[PDB]
């Protein structure tokens, strides 16, 4: 896994783009709002892209 431990990072830009991140405490793939730039690695376009990676 790895970076799967970082919290979701919205980043500086102010768009409302919906993305998935792994909530490692929850054991769950969760939706967050991504801003459109400087995305970290715990940030997936899809729920399964997520569970798959972690």
């Amino acid at each position: 896994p790895d970076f799967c431990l970082e919290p979701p990072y919205t980043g500086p830009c102010k768009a409302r783009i919906i993305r998935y991140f792994y909530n490692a405490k929850a054991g769950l793939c969760q939706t967050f709002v991504y801003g459109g730039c400087r995305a970290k690695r715990n940030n997936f376009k899809s729920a399964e892209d997520c569970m798959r990676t972690c």
Binding site: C13, K14, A15, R16, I17, I18, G36, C37, R38, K45
Partner: protein, 241 residues
């Protein structure tokens, strides 16, 4: 829009909503019968043009408005400077599939010429349907929100950003940008307001001074929002009128 207030219906006729797969992601500003200014990052390459729609004359985002045209997009041109930056050139032109008809509720804003400067501390209005706070949604039926914010020079704005700056999270205000907001925060644009107009009145007349772009948080102290300068791109935008 964090710390604002609800606009009256029809008070910002140039404001548009941008939906990808029917979800609002960005604001935009209408500039002619068929064109819209917004922000490059509201349009990642992974998305499909066919799945972008645009709502106009839209006051309450979650309400059937009588006169609120909707259009698909014929074209999307992010500024040439963008796909190789993520640091500058954060603007795009959206060509509507068909020119639309202006009404009391749908009307473009005027662009500032390339050699146009707005005094600092000038009070301007930003407008959006963004979060009303850090990851807190605007409440249905999502009335367009507005907010007066003073313009801040980019030199002063860089002073502010350096306060408690995290070495790993650099924020710099480039030449194509401008800041607007309050240093004690609480007032600022938030997620979902990108592409939105920063409208500045100059002599009873509204100019599109900036396009809502980025900011550290929203309502953060010493972190006023940064907007893409319209004037810095007048040359380019005029290249399609």
């Amino acid at each position: 829009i964090t710390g604002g207030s609800s606009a009256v219906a029809g008070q910002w006729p140039w404001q548009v909503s941008i939906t990808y797969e029917g979800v609002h992601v960005c604001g935009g500003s209408l500039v002619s019968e068929q064109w819209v200014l917004s922000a490059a990052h509201c349009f990642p390459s992974e998305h499909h043009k066919e799945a972008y729609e645009v709502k106009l004359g839209a006051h309450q985002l979650d309400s059937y408005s009588e006169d609120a045209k909707v259009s698909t997009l014929k074209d999307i041109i992010p500024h040439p400077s963008y796909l190789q930056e993520g640091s500058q050139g954060d603007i795009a032109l959206l060509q509507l599939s068909r020119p639309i008809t202006f009404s009391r509720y749908i009307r473009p804003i005027s662009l500032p010429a390339a050699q146009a400067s707005f005094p600092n501390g000038l009070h301007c209005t930003v407008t959006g349907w963004g979060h009303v706070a850090p990851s807190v949604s605007l409440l249905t039926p999502k009335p367009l929100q507005q907010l007066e914010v003073p313009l801040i020079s980019r030199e002063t704005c860089n002073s502010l950003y350096n306060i408690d700056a995290k070495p790993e999270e650099p924020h710099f205000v480039q030449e194509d940008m401008v800041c607007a907001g309050y240093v004690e925060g609480g007032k600022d644009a938030c997620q979902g307001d990108s592409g939105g107009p920063l409208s500045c009145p100059v002599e009873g007349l509204w100019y599109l001074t900036g396009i809502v772009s980025w900011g550290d948080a929203c309502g953060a102290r010493n972190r006023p929002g940064v907007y893409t300068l319209a004037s810095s791109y007048a040359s380019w935008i005029q290249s399609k009128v």
